[PDB]
Amino acid sequence: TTIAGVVYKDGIVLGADTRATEGMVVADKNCSKIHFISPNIYCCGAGTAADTDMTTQLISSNLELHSLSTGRLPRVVTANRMLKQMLFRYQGYIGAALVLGGVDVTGPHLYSIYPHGSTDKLPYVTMGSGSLAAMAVFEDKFRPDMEEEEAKNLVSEAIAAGIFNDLGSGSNIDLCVISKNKLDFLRPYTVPNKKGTRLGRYRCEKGTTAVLTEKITPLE
Amino acid sequence: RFSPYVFNGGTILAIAGEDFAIVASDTRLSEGFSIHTRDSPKCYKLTDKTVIGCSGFHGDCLTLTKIIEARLKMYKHSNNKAMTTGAIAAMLSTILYSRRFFPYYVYNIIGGLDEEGKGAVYSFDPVGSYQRDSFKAGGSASAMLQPLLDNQVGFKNMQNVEHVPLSLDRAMRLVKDVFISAAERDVYTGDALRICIVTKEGIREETVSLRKD
Amino acid sequence: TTTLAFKFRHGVIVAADSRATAGAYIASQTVKKVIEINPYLLGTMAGGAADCSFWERLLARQCRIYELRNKERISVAAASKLLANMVYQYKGMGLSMGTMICGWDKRGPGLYYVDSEGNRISGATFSVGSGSVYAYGVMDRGYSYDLEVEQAYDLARRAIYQATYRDAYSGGAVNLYHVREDGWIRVSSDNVADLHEKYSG
Amino acid sequence: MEYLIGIQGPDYVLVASDRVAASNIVQMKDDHDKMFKMSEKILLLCVGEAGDTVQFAEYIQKNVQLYKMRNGYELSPTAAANFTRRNLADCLRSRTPYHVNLLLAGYDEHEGPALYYMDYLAALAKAPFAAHGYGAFLTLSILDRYYTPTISRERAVELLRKCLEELQKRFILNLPTFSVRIIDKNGIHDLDNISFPKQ
Amino acid sequence: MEYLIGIQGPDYVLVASDRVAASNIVQMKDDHDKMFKMSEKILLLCVGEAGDTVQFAEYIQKNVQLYKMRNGYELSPTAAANFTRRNLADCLRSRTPYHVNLLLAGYDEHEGPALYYMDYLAALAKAPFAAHGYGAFLTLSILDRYYTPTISRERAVELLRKCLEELQKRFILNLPTFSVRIIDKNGIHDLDNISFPKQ
Amino acid sequence: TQNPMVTGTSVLGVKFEGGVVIAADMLGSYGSLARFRNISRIMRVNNSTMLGASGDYADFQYLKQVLGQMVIDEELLGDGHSYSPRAIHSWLTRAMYSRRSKMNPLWNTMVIGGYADGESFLGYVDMLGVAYEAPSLATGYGAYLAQPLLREVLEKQPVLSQTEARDLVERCMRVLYYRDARSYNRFQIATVTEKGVEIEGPLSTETNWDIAHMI
Amino acid sequence: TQNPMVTGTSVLGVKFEGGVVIAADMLGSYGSLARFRNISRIMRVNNSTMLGASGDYADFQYLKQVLGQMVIDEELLGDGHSYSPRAIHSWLTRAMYSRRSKMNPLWNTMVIGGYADGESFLGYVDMLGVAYEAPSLATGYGAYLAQPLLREVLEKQPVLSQTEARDLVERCMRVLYYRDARSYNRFQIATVTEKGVEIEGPLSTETNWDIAHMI
Amino acid sequence: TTIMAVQFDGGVVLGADSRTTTGSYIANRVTDKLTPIHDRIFCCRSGSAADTQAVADAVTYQLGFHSIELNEPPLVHTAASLFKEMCYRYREDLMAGIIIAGWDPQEGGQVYSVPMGGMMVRQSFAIGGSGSSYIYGYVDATYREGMTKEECLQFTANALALAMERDGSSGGVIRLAAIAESGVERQVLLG
Amino acid sequence: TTIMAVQFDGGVVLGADSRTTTGSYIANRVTDKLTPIHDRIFCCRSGSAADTQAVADAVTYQLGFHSIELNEPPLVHTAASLFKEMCYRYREDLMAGIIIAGWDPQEGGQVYSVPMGGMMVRQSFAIGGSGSSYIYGYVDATYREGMTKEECLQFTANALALAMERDGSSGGVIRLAAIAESGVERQVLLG
Amino acid sequence: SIMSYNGGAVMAMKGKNCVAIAADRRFGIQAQMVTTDFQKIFPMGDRLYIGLAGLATDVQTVAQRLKFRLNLYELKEGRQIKPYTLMSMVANLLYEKRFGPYYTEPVIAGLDPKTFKPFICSLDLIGCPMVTDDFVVSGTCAEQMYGMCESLWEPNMDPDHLFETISQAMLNAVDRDAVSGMGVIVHIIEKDKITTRTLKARMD
């Protein structure tokens, strides 16, 4: 797990890697850590998966409620304030390493949340287990007010370096770009890995296993 | 506190044929959630007919390899002939028990030919037992690999499936398939696969890459 | 892991399973547990693999030296005593070893039981291992002294079958050795599923 | 500590228990009774943490008597067993857990005989012959050796005789006297008290 | 675990033991022997940590045989008892302690009968009747009820019969068979094996 | 050493064409206190090899002493034979293993760089005896931070020149000054070629802070 | 309070003829660090009583607040009735006991000095609720150090004058500056008489270092 | 980490680094360690981060509501009392090194300090944070009563400079704050 | 506790307090913290007391035997190597904060420092003891390369003054030592 | 481990137009078996099953608890339940015990109620869903079943090869396992009908 965020000259580029390890064994090869919050705000999670999931669904429900109650576009600082108040109210028991990003009336705003309730506004953040490699790539090749394809190439490069380094990282790479008007969301950004075709067809035959007791139940 | 052991991982396979012994192993040497290298072959060529693989804690693997080579040279300079396979197995069992009360954290697999020219794989444990089996998979991906060799090599749990002797290139595609399939779910399977084949005519080696994840 | 041994009129029967796990994971299915010391002794494997193999191999060394010094093959009680004396010098250091010693004597049948706790006793019936109590039950049902040969074979084989049916750690193949007056003789190596077919109906 | 065995038949259930009441090291009472008559065809035995046994008898016994007196009729054995399991499963995740381990024995007019099997972790089981304790170990091999699903009751009594003969042979405990019940279409019948003469 | 009793008389010593060999929960051996003949009038029994019993028999037995073969004659029971206590007291304060608890039984031509009493802390004692274990508790009241220093041997056998009848009555253990010795001016006489038929 | 008192920090080393460059900084930290701001953490071994280390500095002084004495002894043999860098790597591995087998470890993390007979060499030695060869080594947090830069540039192009290698080391040391809390803006570059072993002076970094004007 | 953060040190108080003098120093040590070298550790309660304390300073601020509020409440009753010092002592004892029964103690060691109706008063309150009256009190290390001077002079002569009492306090505070490691050469003297309650300024000590010339 | 507050005749001057650390890794190079509450009152924090952020937000809440209800500019001692109550009440869960400073119309410039216990004291200058221990020598050497504004700025610049130079955890960049009747003047210096 | 060593052009200057503490009780107010090993080489100690006393006595033994056997005045680096060996060989039982200084005929004035780890380094000035942390600011601000003797004495006086003022364990009285070719000048100051 | 108290293994495998779920039969306390007829695969409506593995207490408790909420849902709304809905319900029910956690790893395998679309997912002990396309497993012998399904799976599978593949996978992965064995029950379902077969596994 290696998530990253950045702010280019107009908006926000978020990334992810979709290897859900459970301990030491690869449990998933295709997951989704970029979650919905609002039509303009998204979020990424790290660490304990179900904690991030339930927390982000609760906050997304509450902000959808608030936005429909108000009648206008949500603000990112409201999401930040709800998250930090809840995570501090749980005393750091819930582990939810969050990256928060959205575009308000004020513009693009990126927040990273550490699971006790400590938050920071930054132009670029990395979170997760392999965040150090992506933060290395960011500090190497960042400049203020980048363009779009520059930022997309940079975030792809950073998470790719995290996958070629980290052991809990490594799958196909998720991206998300938020502007004032154009929201994009892509399943495989750049698929670095292939897989060798099987060399032996180890296919079983129709009856190669002894059966003791059958049952048939028809349906409609 | 100071912990004296660490798990470097690795995966070693062996297949005993009618007249061949194939030993293969990944070459990733790692620690925790990092990669130290992507080229470190676990196989070692002892004699003209014996290849040993060693996974687990890496420093004990290096030390054990060097001690085995030294005692091989001692046997040669005493008795004018190289050791057999079972002699190396007995000696290695004595060594692995000789540090019982501060154990090696080392899985060991010896493949090679016997004196009749047949395949023989002697497995081990960290404390010093051994047994003559036809196939073993040692290391982190042991449980990902033993039942599939039971399905293909051992012909277990099947019905109306005859027993064909295991040929050579069939064993090769087996080794390649099991390392690809185990590298999909494992975190310790390397990239470089180092396949050592022991025949009655020498030692062959072969390097096959994998996905670079 | 479940072994047993019992002596009767025509010598000693020794049988064992062949499963040796590692925690919840099975290492192998064909671990030959009854360790062949001599053409007249049989030792077992009871918990520790490396420890039983090593110390019984060292006992075999001592016995062969004894034979070459006395021109007379060692008795069973002497061998068990030497094994217990060698094991006691590491008490508390964490040896697990519960083996059995069988063989023929000038006195005849011999059956001893040597622990890593250093217990050394004679007897007529024994069973060692995790599922040993299961073997104790059906064996102490069917035990007598005046038994036939095939009766004892069926008793021991059925006993190990019941043990592996109840225990989770026991399984694999049922080995079967028979100690006679002249020397020991392997009887058969029967799989569990074949016995399941044989005794289910 | 001990174990009470529960052999199920084709049309009867053969349950047995001891008459032993443990202490520090002394046998305080040698005519103890673990039998809790729930209904006319449903028995209950109990072994576990010895403060919970009487209160389980209170809860289950009295709530079954409540159902029977309310609705006019007797419970099935299955629903009663499941009700015990439910009260265990509710009582487990609290500040006050109960630690008991027994099997339940009933008989329906329609379902016939039935044997269930709990644990201190509230697990249902529908067993042909079950066990708990330490007599569990030395007895299930003998019982699984000599079992026939279509077995007659006197053969079951002889089998229980044999099972006891292997209980008094290699045990580190005493277990002198066993009480034995049987359940049929006629209800709850008591067989003779099964002891073995000491001196 | 168990206890082996040692009743002393005016001119005889009545020692006894079991035939029980404990395990995990099983009774591995039902004909065990705890009797270690030191000399022609000195016996030894042993209960404790069951790896030390045989080696104590080795050390004490063989060094007493060394004294007898060297100097030409038998030890007193008192000096042998003190020698055992000395080897215990030396073996206590080391890296390798021994954990046994047995009383010693001898007979002198001049001092007559003698009973000693050890512990796992190497304490000598000269007792009229002594004990160890858990049978100690349930048996010393009966023995201290019916004791006369000038008691005849058949009365002692009847008293031991009574003591066993209170061992099989409120104990949590099995203890089926006891072997019984006696020591006199003639030497070691083996009495009959004291069992109860169970079924 | 059970408890390391005065630790160094990360060491970087990478091969290039006919040479190995190694650079580590010059700070001796106790806890959080940067107590010793002028120390040397690279020994220039005789003419073909070169050592850099982390962890407890006292143990590094000890191994400095022992290796110096061994090199002096072979140079006094007068046979024309020297130690290959791989022989030194093997000896050091055996030393660490014999330390840790007796439960008295030398708290270090050492990098051996050498160039002999046409071939470059870059070896690693851990405290636990874990030892291997690599085209680029990185210790401590360098394995988390400056390792992906090394493996990034080395995967796109496996060989390098000396200028490119030195520039890459400068960038990696800049990054380590950026995000190590135990780091310091003064480092020395050490280089082996066929011309001998050369230690450059205490260079520094040029940093950027234009993100601070962003509120 | 489970762990006392910022502790004071010893407080000295002694009766005399128609008054009670109390003196404690002005230091706010954290651990071994003398962090707060100007704080007040004596509250001048309304006109008849006076409080001094040790231990955790935050709890002293808390009891300062609560006692101030209680005194304000009775002064706003307007009945002409005040608190005797023994009533305050009783209330504070009940407060400490109810703190420690709930396993949440106030980490303090308090001295109550008062003069009302001809009779002097000097009360003690521990953290555990142990409370008594005494002609001379000494807290912390003062009970080990300046206590024998008080009990020495008071046994030879049970009553005192104000000058003798103040001089004895000066000598005791000098000794506590000599051999308390958590001590400081600045203290304030607080005094009750029939004339009211008076806090003197930050006095100091005069030391003797003539033992240092002995080698 | 290393935070600093110095008053002078007209008003007060604050200062902090920004090197917010976690373990041995630098998480953030630049941080607003000093936080506005009212237009004339600041606080600078240390210890744990989430604790001080939540406490500063709740104090901002209570103080803003009270100062609107007063229809008067608030006191500094009031905000100090609020931090005192919230720190002291939960000294079991918070690690706060809160230092309050700010100019006041009634009382001029004031500096209050609240360490990890929950005590409150008024000082003329303050040292807060784990790396302030190293410059207690420098601040008890160089300080002189009755400085000007520029002398206080130069003073705290040299102070936080030496603290950043020696301690490993401190570092980053220097933030300053100057509070008087005329306004708040913030700047970011390095040297 | 707080020990200090500063070299200058002609020689070196040492200094220490004497507040040797045990727990929270002062056992001794005045202590010879600095020790003459040879007539031109000093060491000042910290950490545990008995450890450093035994180490200084054994170093005095070996160095005296060696310097008599040389029939030449000893080097300073020699004594530094001896303390290095004895500290490093038994890091497991000793707690030594030994700082070696002294003038030498061959090499002038030198200052070596040996902390608890047993490492050895040459410095131009040194800070030793548990209460030196509070003046690492002042020793980095006030030091200037190329002082005189009187400036070094005033310097270490102000240093140990602020250290004694701030740390609780430190205190007592100031001992000084000035070492040059002309002699050893010890004095006891307060201020 | 509390997860290794009673053993257990549940495998689900997605085929072409059908889905097959299988589990073991053994029940017992850790080394002692008890019975061979313990139910771990429960019916939740038609053409949709759930498998439960781990501690048997939480197995029966969560199964009855889920049946409670399931029937309440299917009675408040006349339609039958979609599989994503069931997945979210199990996730919410497990997450209600965030700090009082059940010890179970539910595996859901069922078809689409409108189309013939298959569905598989698995959850963790706190409520982390995971939808895949090939297979999900749960229990002690995880790594064995991972090796089997990553060794033997093909994307487009007729039900016969689906049945034999899941059969061989379960037999071999169970036979390497110790505490989990004693028979295999296999449910192979499709759009038209539901087939349940039991395999001749080693009874050892």
Chains B and C make contact, 3+ CB pairs within 8 Å: yes
For the sheet with J118-122, list strands across it: J41-43, J48-51, J107-111, J118-122, J130-131
CB count in 10 Å sphere of residue F13: 27
* Beta carbons of I165 and H140 less than 8 Å apart: yes
Interface probe with D: pick from C126, C127, C136, most Cβ of D within 10 Å = C136
Listed residue (B157, E170, J177) closest to C169, CA to CA = J177
Amino acid at the residue D108: D
Pairs across B and J, CB distance < 8 A: 48
Domains of chain J and any CATH numbers? 1-204 (3.60.20.10)
Domains of chain C and any CATH numbers? 1-201 (3.60.20.10)
CB count in 10 Å sphere of residue B66: 13
Distance from CA of G63 to the nearest CA of I (A): 27
State the helix-helix crossing angle for B168-185 and J142-152, rounded to 10 degrees.
120
The two tokens of residue G10 are 């010893």
Q: At the top level of CATH, which class does the domain A1-220 belong to?
A: alpha beta
β A34-36/F196-203 pair status: unpaired
Residue J177 CB-density burial (10 A; 0-12 exposed, 13-18 middle, 19+ buried)? buried
Consecutive H or E run containing D142: helix D135-145
Q: F-contacting residues of B 102-121, CB under 8 Å? A: 102
Consecutive H or E run containing B181: helix B168-185
Q: Does C198 touch chain J (CB under 8 A)?
A: no
Distance from CA of G30 to the nearest CA of H (A): 10
- Measured CA to CA, the distance from residue H173 to residue G77 in angstroms comes to 58
Distance, first Cα to last Cα, chain I: 18
Q: J-contacting residues of C 10-49, CB under 8 Å? A: 19, 21, 24-26
Closest CB from C140, C158, C166 relative to D166: C140
**Quick check: G122 and G111 in contact, CB under 8 A?**
yes
Domain count, chain E: 1
SS3 of residue E122 by DSSP: coil
In I71-175, which residue ranges form alpha helices assigned H by DSSP? 76-89, 136-141, 149-166
- Measured CA to CA, the distance from residue B25 to residue B205 in angstroms comes to 12
Q: Which contacts of H72-78 are long-range, i.e. CB under 8 A and separated by 24 or more positions? A: H73/H38, H73/H40, H73/H104, H73/H105, H74/H38, H74/H41, H75/H104, H75/H106, H75/H107, H76/H41, H76/H100, H76/H101, H76/H102, H76/H104, H76/H107, H76/H110, H76/H112, H77/H107, H77/H110, H77/H112
Domain count, chain B: 1
**Quick check: B93 and B128 in contact, CB under 8 A?**
yes
- Measured CA to CA, the distance from residue D42 to residue D60 in angstroms comes to 12
**Quick check: I151 and I139 in contact, CB under 8 A?**
no
**Quick check: B48 and B201 in contact, CB under 8 A?**
no
Pairs across C and D, CB distance < 8 A: 36
- The residue count of chain G comes to 215
Distance from CA of A116 to the nearest CA of H (A): 6
Q: Does D21 touch chain E (CB under 8 A)?
A: no
Q: Which residues on F lie below 8 Å from A170 (Cβ)? A: none
Q: Which residues on H lie below 8 Å from I134 (Cβ)? A: 133-134, 136-137
CB count in 10 Å sphere of residue I66: 15
Distance, first Cα to last Cα, chain A: 45
Interface probe with H: pick from F30, F32, F35, most Cβ of H within 10 Å = F32
* Beta carbons of B158 and A194 less than 8 Å apart: no
Amino acid at the residue E173: L
Q: Residue B160: which region, alpha, beta or left (left: phi > 0; alpha: psi -120 to 50)?
A: left
- Measured CA to CA, the distance from residue F36 to residue J85 in angstroms comes to 63
Q: What are phi and psi of D161, to 5 degrees?
A: -55, -50
- Measured CA to CA, the distance from residue E119 to residue I128 in angstroms comes to 59
β A25-28/A20-22 pair status: antiparallel
Q: Return all residues near A20 (Cβ < 8 A) that are at least 6 apart.
A: A1, A26, A27, A28, A31, A49, J130
- The residue count of chain F comes to 215
* Interface list for chain H against chain F, based on CB atoms closer than 8 Å: 18-19, 21, 23-26, 29-30, 32, 130-131, 166-169, 171, 173, 188, 190
For CA atoms J146, J150, J151, J152, the dihedral sign is positive
Distance from CA of G211 to the nearest CA of H (A): 29
- The residue count of chain C comes to 201
Q: Which residues of A171-186 are buried (b: 16+ CB within 10 A; e: fewer)?
A: bbbbbbbbeeeeeeee
- Measured CA to CA, the distance from residue D164 to residue B51 in angstroms comes to 58
The two tokens of residue H105 are 């119309």
Structure-derived torsion over alpha carbons of residues D89, D90, D93, D99, reported in degrees to the nearest 10: -60
C159 is in an annotated binding site: no
Amino acid at the residue F90: S
State the residue for tokens 């804690």: B57
- Measured CA to CA, the distance from residue J11 to residue J27 in angstroms comes to 17
Q: Which residues on C lie below 8 Å from D139 (Cβ)? A: 137
Q: Does B2 touch chain C (CB under 8 A)?
A: no
Interface probe with B: pick from F14, F99, F107, F132, most Cβ of B within 10 Å = F132
Q: According to the entry, how was the structure determined?
A: cryo-EM
Q: How far is CA B73 from CA B30, B67, B92, B96, F143, in A?
A: 31, 10, 14, 19, 39
Side-chain half-sphere CA neighbours of D1 within 13 A: 20
Q: Which residues on D lie below 8 Å from C133 (Cβ)? A: 137-138, 141
Q: Which residues of B153-176 are buried (b: 16+ CB within 10 A; e: fewer)?
A: bbebbbeeeeeeebeeebbbebbb
* Beta carbons of J37 and D126 less than 8 Å apart: yes
Closest CB from C25, C30, C32 relative to B143: C25
Interface probe with D: pick from J57, J96, J97, J104, most Cβ of D within 10 Å = J57
- Measured CA to CA, the distance from residue I29 to residue I171 in angstroms comes to 8
3-state secondary structure chain F: CCCCCCECCCEEEEEECCEEEEEEECCEEECCEEEECCCCCEECCCCCEEEEEEEEHHHHHHHHHHHHHHHHHHHHHCCCCCCCHHHHHHHHHHHHHHHHHCCCCCCEEEEEEEEECCEEEEEEECCCCCEEECCEEECCCHHHHCHHHHHHHHHHCCCCCHHHHHHHHHHHHHHHHHHECCCCCCEEEEEEECCEEEEEEEECCCCCCCCCCCC
CB count in 10 Å sphere of residue A6: 25
The two tokens of residue D123 are 């697990």
Domain count, chain F: 1
E strands, H8-128, where? 12-16, 20-22, 25-28, 34-36, 41-44, 99-104, 108-113, 121-123, 125-128
- Measured CA to CA, the distance from residue H187 to residue H177 in angstroms comes to 7
Residue F97 CB-density burial (10 A; 0-12 exposed, 13-18 middle, 19+ buried)? buried
Q: Which residues on A lie below 8 Å from B141 (Cβ)? A: none
- Measured CA to CA, the distance from residue E57 to residue E66 in angstroms comes to 14
CB count in 10 Å sphere of residue F18: 15
Listed residue (H171, H161, H132) closest to H153, CA to CA = H161
Amino acid at the residue J115: T
The two tokens of residue H121 are 């004291």
Q: What are phi and psi of H158, to 5 degrees?
A: -65, -35
Consecutive H or E run containing I189: strand I183-189
| Set G1, G49, G109, G193: catalytic member | G1
Range of the domain at D97: 1-199
